[PDB]
Amino acid sequence: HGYITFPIARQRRCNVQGGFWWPPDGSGIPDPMCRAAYQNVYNKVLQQGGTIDQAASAAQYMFQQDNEYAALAGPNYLDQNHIRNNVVPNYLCAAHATTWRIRPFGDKTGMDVSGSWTPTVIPLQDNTVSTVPIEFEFCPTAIHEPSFFEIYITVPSFNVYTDQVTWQQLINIFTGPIPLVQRRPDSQCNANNLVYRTTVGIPVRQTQFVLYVRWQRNDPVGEGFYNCADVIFAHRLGINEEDKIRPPKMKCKGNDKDCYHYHKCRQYNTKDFNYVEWNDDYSDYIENHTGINRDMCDSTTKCCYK
Amino acid sequence: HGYITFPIARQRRCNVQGGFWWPPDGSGIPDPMCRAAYQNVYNKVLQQGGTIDQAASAAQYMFQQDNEYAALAGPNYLDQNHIRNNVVPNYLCAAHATTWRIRPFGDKTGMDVSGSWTPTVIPLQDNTVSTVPIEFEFCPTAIHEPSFFEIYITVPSFNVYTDQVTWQQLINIFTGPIPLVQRRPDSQCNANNLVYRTTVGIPVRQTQFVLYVRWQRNDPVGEGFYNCADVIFAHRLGINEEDKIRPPKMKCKGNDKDCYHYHKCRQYNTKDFNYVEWNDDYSDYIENHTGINRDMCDSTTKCCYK
Numbered sequence A, B: 001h002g003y004i005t006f007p008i009a010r011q012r013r014c015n016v017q018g019g020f021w022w023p024p025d026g027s028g029i030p031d032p033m034c035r036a037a038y039q040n041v042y043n044k045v046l047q048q049g050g051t052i053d054q055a056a057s058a059a060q061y062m063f064q065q066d067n068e069y070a071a072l073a074g075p076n077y078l079d080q081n082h083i084r085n086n087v088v089p090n091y092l093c094a095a096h097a098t099t100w101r102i103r104p105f106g107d108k109t110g111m112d113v114s115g116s117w118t119p120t121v122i123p124l125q126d127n128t129v130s131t132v133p134i135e136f137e138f139c140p141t142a143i144h145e146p147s148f149f150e151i152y153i154t155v156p157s158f159n160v161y162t163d164q165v166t167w168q169q170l171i172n173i174f175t176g177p178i179p180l181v182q183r184r185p186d187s188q189c190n191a192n193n194l195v196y197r198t199t200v201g202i203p204v205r206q207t208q209f210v211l212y213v214r215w216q217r218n219d220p221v222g223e224g225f226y227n228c229a230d231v232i233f234a235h236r237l238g239i240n241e242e243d244k245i246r247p248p249k250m251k252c253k254g255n256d257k258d259c260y261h262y263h264k265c266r267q268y269n270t271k272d273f274n275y276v277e278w279n280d281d282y283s284d285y286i287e288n289h290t291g292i293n294r295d296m297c298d299s300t301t302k303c304c305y306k
């Protein structure tokens, strides 16, 4: 049992943020995607003749079990076609938990909805890097050995706003054991003294992407843990350094001066231009001249029935 | 002569924002990409033995001539291979103006630098749309007829932060005459009573992209006007509606109430979680455990020379 702590797993972030214990309808959950995830399981149980308590119990079970996003593979856990077709065929972010009446693994299908899932923002040092190394931290709340990990990244055409995570949209970037090490005082994990920690080069994406992490136990039970992690790279602002022409080193003089550890925790207006007023009228232009409901003729054409 | 007013052309936005007349080194330009564009032409002239005035004159000529981002094609303006190889082979956003000593068309190469160019933000009604109609507005400051337009969009793999706009990264989405019509009171154009206005379905992009607009005169001179326009679609926040399970219409009662024109112009904290303090420590985690300078051993390992 466990979950990704860095980058924080989707279901882990929803659990830690809370507000899901009361009210029972999930209206206290501040994140809209964690709220929509809760409310989808809640609403689904109600549709199937469940009571408010059975609906709230199934939705709360999905959030509470953030360390048990699991599926049993049996003794044939190394068979790729067995995992992709029988163990986790779909509902990848839920680890194929689709039965609210049967626990384990209940119904965690709320976690596979598409939309604006909050990501870990990784800033780029330079916008030209091909890969960014990240030190993955997997938090085991229960210690299980022997075990191995598989880390996947979504293909560049995956869209988190509209797409379900599928095996056909995932690229394997890691496979093998991850050594069990001592947590650092820094650790995002607080279950025991140990973590799974490793550097993985993450291929750069110009869009929000998903990192799929499978933690498989090498045993006849074949229990595997599957987690979705939402990530995004922040681009560095300014000119690309390689395009920047530098001035020659000069020394100048004249009576017109205009002619020549810790870190820090409207501006575009000039003496010859008012950006605030211009950008407000330009925002209005965007609204009325883009989309299926844009102004075409009504502000210029008058008609009557003859 | 003219420039795109909607979506605002790259060189038009830099000109309107101002701050480029004084100081002569361009330090008064508020937008970093307009400033880097100015300073690249300024610095280039200085490197070639130009004086501060010849450097400031060439950089100011690039900004001032926002309606003359032009190239002469000659009588064979319909020959695609003549345009892509001889007329505008490179420096597409500058309309291949590479000579500061010779006017027209001077040096406008500052406009082809890569980086965080400010885009027109177009909000999506739904994140599942394939195309978004926009009403293009081309502002003619000089009226020229007969003439035609070609509108291009960049390929999905184009990256504005690092890539030069090339013909190999552009997809033609419009070709033909655009009727000359009366400006609307709404108009972003203020040169004369007329504009070029048309609806074009813009293919959806999940990243910042460029719209390349070529306004060609049908005449033996074959003067063409070429403009880059930076654009981005804003995604709608929340759950994708198609994934949303709705509750059944119910009527409830009990003593615990928790159980059941014009428009408008920290929040994620709950009674059971402090997000502000958690998200500050998590931002610090990102900084120290991502990138080539992340902490690996130094906070845990002590060494000495024997």
Ligand SMILES: [Zn+2]
Pocket: A001, A002, A142, A143, A144
């Ligand atoms: Zn376990």
Ligand SMILES: [Zn+2]
Pocket: A261, A263
């Ligand atoms: Zn420092």
Ligand SMILES: [Zn+2]
Pocket: B001, B002, B142, B143, B144
């Ligand atoms: Zn003209």
Ligand SMILES: [Zn+2]
Pocket: B261, B263
């Ligand atoms: Zn309204």
